[PDB]
Structure formats: C-alpha cells, structure tokens
Amino acid sequence: EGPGEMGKPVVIPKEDQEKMKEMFKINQFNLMASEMIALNRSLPDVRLEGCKTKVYPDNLPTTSVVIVFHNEAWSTLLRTVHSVINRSPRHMIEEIVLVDDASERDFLKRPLESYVKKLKVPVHVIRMEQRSGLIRARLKGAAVSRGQVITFLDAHCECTAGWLEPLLARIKHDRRTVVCPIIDVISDDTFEYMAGSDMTYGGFNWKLNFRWYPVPQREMDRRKGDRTLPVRTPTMAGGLFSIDRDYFQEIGTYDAGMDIWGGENLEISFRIWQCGGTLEIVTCSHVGHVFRKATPYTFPGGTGQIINKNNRRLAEVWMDEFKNFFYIISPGVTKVDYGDISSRLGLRRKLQCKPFSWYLENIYPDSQIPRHYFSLGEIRNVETNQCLDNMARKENEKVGIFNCHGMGGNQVFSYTANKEIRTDDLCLDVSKLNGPVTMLKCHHLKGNQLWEYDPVKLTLQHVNSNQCLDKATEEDSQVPSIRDCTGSRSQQWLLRNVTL
Amino acid sequence: GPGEMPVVIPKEKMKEMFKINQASEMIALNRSLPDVRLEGCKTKVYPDNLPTTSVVIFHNESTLRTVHSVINRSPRHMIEEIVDASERDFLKRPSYVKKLKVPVVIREQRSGLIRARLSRGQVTFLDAHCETAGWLEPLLARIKHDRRTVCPIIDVISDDTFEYMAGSDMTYGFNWKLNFRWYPVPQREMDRRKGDRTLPVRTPTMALFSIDRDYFQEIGTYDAGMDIWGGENLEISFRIWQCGGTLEIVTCSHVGHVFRKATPYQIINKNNRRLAEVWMDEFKNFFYIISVTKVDYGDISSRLGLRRKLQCKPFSWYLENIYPDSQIPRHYFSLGEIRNVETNQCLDNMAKENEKVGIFNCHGMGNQVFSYTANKEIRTDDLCLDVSKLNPVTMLKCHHLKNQLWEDPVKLTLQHVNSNQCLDKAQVPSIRDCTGSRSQQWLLRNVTL
Amino acid sequence: GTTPSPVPTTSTTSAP
Amino acid sequence: GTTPSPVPTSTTSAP
Amino acid sequence: TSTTSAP
Ligand SMILES: *[C@@H]1O[C@H](CO)[C@@H](O[C@@H]2O[C@H](CO)[C@@H](O[C@@H]3O[C@H](CO[C@H]4O[C@H](CO)[C@@H](O)[C@H](O)[C@@H]4O)[C@@H](O)[C@H](O[C@H]4O[C@H](CO)[C@@H](O)[C@H](O)[C@@H]4O)[C@@H]3O)[C@H](O)[C@H]2NC(C)=O)[C@H](O)[C@H]1NC(C)=O
Ligand SMILES: *[C@@H]1O[C@H](CO)[C@@H](O[C@@H]2O[C@H](CO)[C@@H](O)[C@H](O)[C@H]2NC(C)=O)[C@H](O)[C@H]1NC(C)=O
Ligand SMILES: O=c1ccn([C@@H]2O[C@H](COP(=O)(O)OP(=O)(O)O)[C@@H](O)[C@H]2O)c(=O)[nH]1
Ligand SMILES: O=c1ccn([C@@H]2O[C@H](COP(=O)(O)OP(=O)(O)O)[C@@H](O)[C@H]2O)c(=O)[nH]1
Ligand SMILES: *[C@@H]1O[C@H](CO)[C@@H](O)[C@H](O)[C@H]1NC(C)=O
Ligand SMILES: *[C@H]1O[C@H](CO)[C@H](O)[C@H](O)[C@H]1NC(C)=O
Ligand SMILES: *[C@H]1O[C@H](CO)[C@H](O)[C@H](O)[C@H]1NC(C)=O
Ligand SMILES: *[C@H]1O[C@H](CO)[C@H](O)[C@H](O)[C@H]1NC(C)=O
Ligand SMILES: [Mn+2]
Ligand SMILES: [Mn+2]
C-alpha cells in the first residue's frame, strides 16, 4: 500500500497536480511523488529466470561505488545509496563515494554528512568546490576510492535483486572486461519501476548520439540462444558501469581535456573496444535509472557555448576516416577548436589500438555509420537540379526534394554497400506501387529498402516495386515520386562524393 | 684588391668592430672569389626552363654583399626575385634595392627564423651574411629532377679576416642534446655514387638549402608552435626523410657563410621537446637523459596529425637507412651510469677531444651518462672512451670503426679487447691486465624513464 | 542531451 | 648558439 | 538538426 512499493506508480491526485508541476521543475522529475516513496522501497526482482539459479564464484573483488551528483534531490540520492547497501552482499562493498559537484542545495551539505555517517557501509562525501564536469568528478571519486573494482552510478538510481554479483564475477573472469547492468526505467512522472530488455544494447548514430538499439541475431547465435550470458555492446550509456581500478588506469581513465558537455561515454566505448578490452551488458544485472527529458541544471558560463568539442576530440583520436560522417552532417563543426589531443594520440600509440574499421566490422557490423558505401553526399536530380532533403523529419515521414544548398547536413545521403539510401539511421522505403518514398528505421534486411543505382544510367530503381525514383509531381511538388521507369532525365540522379 | 679572392691585422679598435656583429672595412660588395666547384661539375650543363627561385633573406648585420653574391653569380633568367625588425641607422629606408637589376623588404615584431621565413618563384633560403660560381644551377636541377628534393656546400668565411675557405664535400648529423654537428660523410655514400663526388650527398641533417614551394607547403612548412631558440633544422630534416622526401648536400653548389662563435642577442628546450615527441619515437630519451622532463612545449597535436596525414615512417627507419652512423645508437645494451663495485663511484666526462675521463661520487642527477652501444662502444654524447696504449682512458670522437671496442654481463668486467686490459679504479680510471677484482667490476645499469 | 530512455519502438517488418 | 663550423681531430682508420 | 537558413 505504501507509495511506490514494488515499483508501483505514484499517481498524484488532481487537487495537487498544479503544485506537482512546480515541484517538477527542480529536478525535471516528479519530486512530490519521490518524497512519498520510501528510501528503502521494495522493487521487483526483474532478472531472467535462469539468473536466479546461477551460483557465482567466491572471493569476488570488493567494489567502491562512485556516485557523482549536481543538485540531486535528497530522496533520490538517499534511495540510491540505500539501494546499493541493502541489495549488495555486505562483504562485496568496500565503500560508497558521493562526489558533490558544486551542488547548491542545503540538504546536500551538512545534513547529508550527518545522515550518511550513520550508515553501516562507509559512505564518504567528497566536494568539488568549483563546478566541474562529470568526468572530473568521477576522476576525483575514483582517485579517492579503495575498492579493486569501481562502480559508477548516477544519483537517481535503484539497484535490484542480484545486481552486483554478476558484474563482479564477469570482472574476476577477465579484468579487461567493462560491465554495465541492464538499465531499467524509473518513471520521471510516477517513479514506477519498469524492467529493461536484455535484447537492447548500445550504439550510436551519425550525430554521435548514444542510442538504444536491438540486439542483433549474431549476438544470439554467439550465445547459442542463452539470454543470461552477457551481451557485447558497441557502446555504453555511460551512467552506470563497473571497471577494475587498475585497468581503468591502464586504458587512460577519461579524456581529461574534455569539457563538461558529455561525450565521454562514446569515447570510452571506442577506446575499450579498439584497445583490446571487452564492453558488456551483463543481462543478469539490473539497475533502474530516472531517465529525464532535459537537464534540470544549466552549465556555468551562460548559453550559446561552443559544443561538440568532445565529439571532435573523440572523433579525431579514434574514428579515423569515418569521422567524416559526423562532420559532413554538422555544418561548421570543423572550425571549433578541440584543444590538445596529444596525450590521447600517444595513448592510442602505446596500446596499439586497432582501427575504427576493425570496430565497425567486428563489434558493430549493424552500425548506423556504413563501413562501406558507394556514395556520400547530396542526391541531385538531373532535370530539376534539386536535392533530396530529409527535412529533419522523423520515422515514417516523407523525404523531400528542394533546392540544393550544398551545406551538407539534412541533404546528405549515402548509397551504402548494403544498397540502402540512408540518412543517418533512416533509410528510403517504398511499400506501395507509386507510393510515397518514406524514411524508416534501417533494418539491414534489404527488401523494400533495397535500391539499385545504375552508375551509367543514373537511375535509382526501387527493387521490390521495380519503379524508378523521379522528380516531384504537380500535386505533391516538394516530394520525389516513384514511377515506372521511362528513361527520362527526370529519372536520372547524381550521387557524387562531397569532399572536405 | 682588398679581401679580393684575406685581411691582415690592422695593428698600429678591431676588437670593437667585431663583437657588435660577432675588419671588412675595404672589402668590396663586388668582390672576386675563387671558383670552388670540382672540375667535373664545370663540364656538366644543366637543363633549361629550370624553375625560377625566390631567395629569402636579415638581423643587425656590408653583408648588400650577400645580395650581390646572388645577383652577380646568378643566371639572370633563373632568379624570380630576392625577398625582420632591424632597428639601426642603416636598417631603415636607406633606396639601394630599387637600383638593382633584380627585383628585391618585409619586416615591426622581433620574430624567430621560422616566423621570418614563413614569394613568386617556384623554388631558396639564405642567411643575411653569405657569399660562388655556378652555385644555383645544381640546386635547381636536382629540384627539377624531383620536386620532393630538399643544400649547397657551405663554405667558411672567416669571422676574423673574412678569408674565404672552401668546405669539404665529404662532410654532411646531430649529437645527444640534439645539437647539429658536422661529421664525415661515410663510405656508403661514396659506394652509392661509385666515387663520383659531383653527385649530391644525402645528408641526414641540415643547418641554407633550396626547396620547391609546393612541396614546402605539402610537408607543413616549419613548426609554427616553436619559439625563437632554434632547432627547426633537425625537425625539418627528420620530417623530410621520414615523410617520403629527400634532403641533399649538392656537392656542385658552393656558398660561403661566416660561421660565428657567439651571438650578440633559462631552459629553452621547448622546440627540442616538440621535435623529439613528434618525430624521434622511443629515441627522445637520449636527449632527456642528459638534459629535466618538465619544459612546457605547447601543443603538438597538429604535428602528430601531419605525421598521420603524410604517412611518415618511424625514426627507426631513419636511423637505420639515413643515419646509421648516428651518435644516438639505434640499438644498445646499456644506458646509464658506469659505477665501480669497489669504490661505488661513477665515470664523469666533466664536459672534449683527447681528454681523460674522470670518476667522482655518483650523484644520479648528465655528465655522468654513458651508453654501452650495440657497436660495443662506451660513448658519452659525441665521444667514445678510447685507450691507445697498454696501461690513460681518454675521450675521442666516435669513429664507428672498432681501440674504442669494449666487451661481460656475468663478470661485469669491461675488457678493452685490443689492449686485453680491464677498466679499474684509479680522478681517472685505470687500465690494467684483468684480475677479477671488485675494483675491476662495474655496474652498467639502465636508468629508468 | 540527456541519455535517451530505452522506449519501445514500432515493429519492424521482416519481409516486403 | 651559432652553427658549428665545418673544420676538423685527426681520425685514425685502424690501430 | 543542422543549419537551415535557405528555402
Ligand atoms: C565515394 O567515396 C568512397 C569512400 O572513399 C569510395 O569508396 C571507396 O572506393 C575504393 C576504391 O574502390 C575502395 O577501395 C577498394 O576496396 C575494395 C574492397 O575492399 C576489400 O578489401 C578490404 C580490406 O580491408 C575489406 O575490408 C573489404 O571488405 C573488401 O574485401 C578493393 O577490391 C579495392 O582493391 C582493388 O584494387 C587493388 C589495386 O588497386 C587490387 O589489388 C584489388 O584486388 C582490387 O582489385 C580497393 O581497395 C574503398 O574501400 C571504398 N570505401 C568504402 C567502400 O568505404 C567511393 O568509390 C566513392 N564514390 C565514387 C563514385 O567515387
Ligand atoms: C524499510 O525500512 C523501514 C524502516 O526500518 C521498515 O519499516 C518497518 O516496517 C515494519 C512493518 O510495518 C515494522 O514492523 C517495523 O517496525 C518498521 N521498522 C521501523 C524501524 O520503523 C520497512 O518495512 C522497510 N521496507 C521494506 C522491508 O520493504
Ligand atoms: O555538471 C554536472 C552535470 C551532471 N552531473 C551528474 O552526472 C550524472 C549524470 O547527469 P544526468 O543524470 O543529468 O544526465 P542523464 O542521465 O539524464 O543522461 C548525474 O548523477 C548528475 O548529477 C555532475 O556531476 N556535474
Ligand atoms: O630574432 C631573431 C633571431 C634570428 N634571426 C635570423 O636568424 C638567422 C641566423 O642567425 P645567425 O646568423 O646568428 O646563426 P649562424 O649562421 O651564425 O649559425 C639570421 O639570418 C638572423 O637574421 C631573425 O631574423 N630574428
Ligand atoms: C637496457 O634497456 C634497453 C632498452 O630496452 C635494453 O635493450 C637492454 O637490454 C637493457 N639492458 C639491460 C637490462 O641490462
Ligand atoms: C516490411 O514492411 C515495412 C512497411 O510496412 C517496410 O517496407 C519494410 O522495409 C519492410 N521490410 C522488408 C525487409 O522489406
Ligand atoms: C686509430 O688511431 C686513434 C689513436 O691514434 C684511435 O685510438 C683509434 O681507436 C685507432 N684505432 C682504430 C681506428 O681502429
Ligand atoms: C535546415 O532544416 C530544414 C528542415 O526544416 C532543412 O532540412 C534544411 O535542408 C536544413 N538545412 C541544412 C541542414 O543545411
Ligand atoms: Mn541520469
Ligand atoms: Mn650566421
């Protein structure tokens, strides 16, 4: 009956709705509800039947949990620390390190210390006096920690039954394995607990956004169908993961030359894979996280700050030629000073890390960036001199045809080796004779996403419909058509490579 | 004929005239000089339509004489034109260049050589105090033969009497401390040329030279993040060799330069650190060991990135193929101090030719650094320990041809083979018939990063 | 931006 | 400092 | 999305 016990949603009665919304602005989640929920509330056991029978070796390495926070709410922070204390075998926890990144909250100062000193696990509170990024706060917290494994968690998380033993067992099996739990969803509206799927892992798109993506078939075949064995994830979300401390040091920790705007998750994923380690989602380990739609904090220095510094650093250090897929869709990013990456290039040199192509081929063959392609650039009609343009539209919407601006971005397409017409993680799709040319999630299963570009006839033939791409019609003038092939110059297209 | 073709002491003030620029009172700007190219270069006729050169020249210099050195000795059809803050009476508007038949002024902010060097001719850098027949055609012909070819023979112009003395075509290197130094051209370079001295020498390092402008740009010019304290010569030599180009001392080209002993105008090892970290690979340590690993050398990201773009080879390829006679050994069995087991003291060179090596308390702090090389030498910088008589241990320029040969990791004895005597305790070690004592035992341990 | 939630998506088709 | 001058130690070729 | 500007 207690609010939220067992992951139950907390619905606020309408009498209070208004006040709730105001309280909602502080953390960009329902604070009114979180404060009704017990700091030790019960949650469901969400592990796959088959993880519950697993017996893990003894002498597993103790872990230090590093939780960094900036203006976290009292209830969420304390629920996180209680969730790790109460749901972790006591002998497997060295300590909890709470890193206060220059928080401006009364309860996060002396009250936090008074409360935490009364816990049965040693919980330390380290203070960044200057607003520092998550990178810097985590480096501080790890430098202070003593446990052989370092577990990073956000300050609005809730561990579940049996979350820790799988991670520590995987690390003891191989110290060069970096492990992430399955990140369950804790509703920012009701704080309802919802389990995440073991069939979803981490990748990225041409924009260098971290993205959730379906676990592909090869990964089920490798495990011969056993979902309880860890998944090799191309990328990590970044909020939650564990790593042996000495190996964390050996791979170069985080890029200390990065600013506060994020990106380290992709950088460290690329670094771990290319430099000889393994990154895994441990499917028997679950930990919930309050995903939010926007951040509740600003970053120091106002707005309009130069962003994509860290994306440039990671791309220039690790991504090789493929960095272009980012640069070409981001007009102007090539003039942002990304500082000094010398130590990072030298680290790549020391460890003889493999090329990004090896990563795309072996770790992420289902990548959104194509490892091989026939063209990257604009798709121009011979007759009307216009270019296809995704118009920033989302899945299931029509691709447009407009005047070529030559600035790249939303008029960039790639005729890939899989013979897709792709723009980031969308592919041109036709599912009806004369139908509209829509943009759907690329599925790597050809079919209606299969096109033939004749390099001499310059025709773009949709294979399953057997119709050619053609200029817009009078009734739908801002959209290309697909029509029985005619040999016209309106059905010819230039798919050239744009360079620097 | 003042100085035409030596200046005698003007005895019964010269001391004053010389140190200002670190004499030359009657020397003509149109002075005669000997033709110093080897007979056999004069028979060579070099192709036509040779690319025109822009000659880049000045700091508180009479020398002007350098401009005439190019003008009077340049085929007019091979010069396109002649191109720092000088705060002196004559170093202003004083008009003369507008009266020369060749087109010849930039200057503001005191800037280094890199910044000053950073034209219309398709190809030449020259100092402001240089001065020979047929000097340009060889350079331009080798350039035309390969635009990725980067030096004249630099003759010595006396800083005391200004007498002209030709330099040998058989000298073309660098030592620990990353100093450029002159060293004899080795046998491999003559065997490649089958004895023909008139073909250019492939020089491991540079100090004046000519280069095609487009290839100059293709390699990234000079390191713009460097300060004014020099070093760019080794950097650009390493870059040219490792990154697929060719650097040469062209023996049919002679040009004089007044080498000096000191300049009229702290640790300034920034540029050295940049160069070593970008091009020298593992080998950077040989510099670090004798000099401090905390000099802030700025940002080298662009330089590593250029090394990535131009697909340059490693410094090991350079040491093995371009400079196998390097002072830095490509392989060595020991690098560190040479400590005696009995007295616990260390060899110390105390900083030159023909001198005795000393031994003092080991401080572990430079002058006590030695290397037992793969060539079985005991070398310190550009010197090797040498003994020339049964029973003194002197320091002689390393010659890379075995009495500098020494030999035992289990007995720890250093046996000079040609003498058949071991090094032993004494302010100088001794050489004595080997006895097996702990006074004849030595620890040759590796100093660690 | 903020880490995306692993939201359920529309079903993909396996054949045309 | 100033570039070293190209002037010659007498070097010996064999002992 | 990237910089539009134009029609
Ligand atoms: C738009 O821009 C893109 C990107 O630059 C261009 O695509 C590249 O085109 C080149 C030239 O064809 C490609 O290089 C070729 O790759 C072929 C296939 O690679 C095999 O080998 C690699 C080894 O790592 C495998 O990973 C891969 O899976 C393949 O197995 C080779 O067949 C080519 O070699 C051919 O020539 C050599 C001699 O030169 C022969 O010895 C070979 O036997 C063979 O005949 C060549 O190496 C490059 O891979 C492409 N990049 C991609 C696909 O990402 C587009 O061409 C360009 N579009 C236009 C219109 O210009
Ligand atoms: C979380 O912790 C609180 C505090 O210990 C637990 O509260 C207990 O609830 C039971 C059931 O009413 C009482 O009998 C105990 O006396 C309570 N303890 C205290 C100290 O008040 C709560 O049950 C815990 N939640 C769980 C286990 O789900
Ligand atoms: O300047 C900052 C911004 C964020 N954080 C912390 O870093 C974690 C990740 O931030 P956030 O939860 O806002 O991002 P999201 O998980 O939504 O992607 C959180 O524990 C934040 O409190 C920090 O320490 N310093
Ligand atoms: O601040 C400076 C220092 C040096 N130089 C130039 O650097 C060249 C080389 O200096 P120097 O002749 O003393 O070296 P050397 O040939 O004697 O070894 C000279 O032409 C100077 O004009 C310059 O232009 N600005
Ligand atoms: C000293 O270090 C060099 C460089 O690796 C090595 O080749 C040599 O064997 C070492 N000498 C020892 C260990 O005596
Ligand atoms: C399946 O149908 C959808 C439309 O509903 C898409 O066209 C998709 O591309 C199809 N899948 C294949 C493999 O053709
Ligand atoms: C050649 O002579 C000098 C001494 O005069 C050197 O000691 C050198 O070691 C001698 N031996 C050689 C070159 O093999
Ligand atoms: C800007 O966004 C619009 C969508 O409204 C168009 O896609 C346009 O092509 C974009 N211009 C770019 C990316 O340069
Ligand atoms: Mn978070
Ligand atoms: Mn000079």
Residue numbers in the entry:
A (entry chain A): 56 to 555
B (entry chain B): 57 to 61, 64 to 70, 74 to 83, 88 to 122, 124 to 127, 130 to 131, 133 to 152, 156 to 166, ...
C (entry chain D): 1 to 16
D (entry chain F): 1 to 8, 10 to 16
E (entry chain H): 10 to 16
Provide text from the study.
A conserved family of N-acetylgalactosaminyl-transferases (GalNAc-Ts) initiate mucin-type O-glycosylation by catalyzing GalNAc transfer from uridine 5′-diphosphate (UDP)–GalNAc to a Thr/Ser on a protein to form Thr/Ser–O-GalNAc. GalNAc-Ts are Golgi-anchored type II membrane proteins containing two luminal domains that are important for activity, including an N-terminal Mn2+-dependent catalytic domain that adopts a glycosyltransferase family A (GT-A) fold. The lectin domain consists of three homologous repeats (α, β, and γ), where α and β, but not γ, have GalNAc-binding potential. The isoenzyme GalNAc-T1 is highly expressed in most tissue types and influences many biological pathways, including salivary gland function, heart development, immune system function, and viral infectivity.
To further validate our biochemical data, we attempted to crystallize both human and mouse GalNAc-T1 (98% identity overall, and 99% identity in the lectin domain) with various glycopeptide substrates but were only able to obtain crystals and an x-ray crystal structure of mouse GalNAc-T1 in complex with Muc5AC-13, UDP, and Mn2+ (Muc5AC-13: GTT3PSPVPTTSTT13GalNAcSAP) to 2.3-Å resolution. The asymmetric unit contains a dimer with one GalNAc-T1–Mn2+–UDP–(Muc5AC-13)2 complex (A) having well-resolved electron density and one GalNAc-T1–Mn2+–UDP–(Muc5AC-13)1 complex (B) with poor electron density. The analysis centers on complex A, where GalNAc-T1 is bound to two Muc5AC-13 glycopeptides, one via the α repeat and the other via the β repeat. The Muc5AC-13 glycopeptide interacting with the β repeat GalNAc binding pocket via Thr13–O-GalNAc correctly positions the acceptor Thr3 into the active site for catalysis. However, the 2Fobs-Fcalc electron density for peptide residues beyond Thr10 is not clear and does not provide evidence that the α repeat correctly positions this glycopeptide into the active site for catalysis. Asp444, His460, and Asn465 are involved in hydrogen bonding to GalNAc in the α repeat, while residues Asp484, His498, and Asn503 participate in hydrogen bonds with GalNAc in the β repeat. β repeat GalNAc-T1 residue Lys496 makes hydrogen bonds with peptide residues Thr9 and Thr10 and a backbone carbonyl in β-bound Muc5AC-13. Glu450 in α repeat of GalNAc-T1 interacts with Lys496 in the β repeat and Thr10 in the β-bound Mu5AC-13, suggesting the presence of intra-lectin domain communications. In addition, Glu450 in the α repeat interacts with Lys496 in the β repeat and Thr10 in the β-bound Muc5AC-13. These interactions can mediate communication between the repeats and further support the observations that Thr–O-GalNAc binding in the β repeat could have long-range effects on GalNAc binding in the α repeat and vice versa.
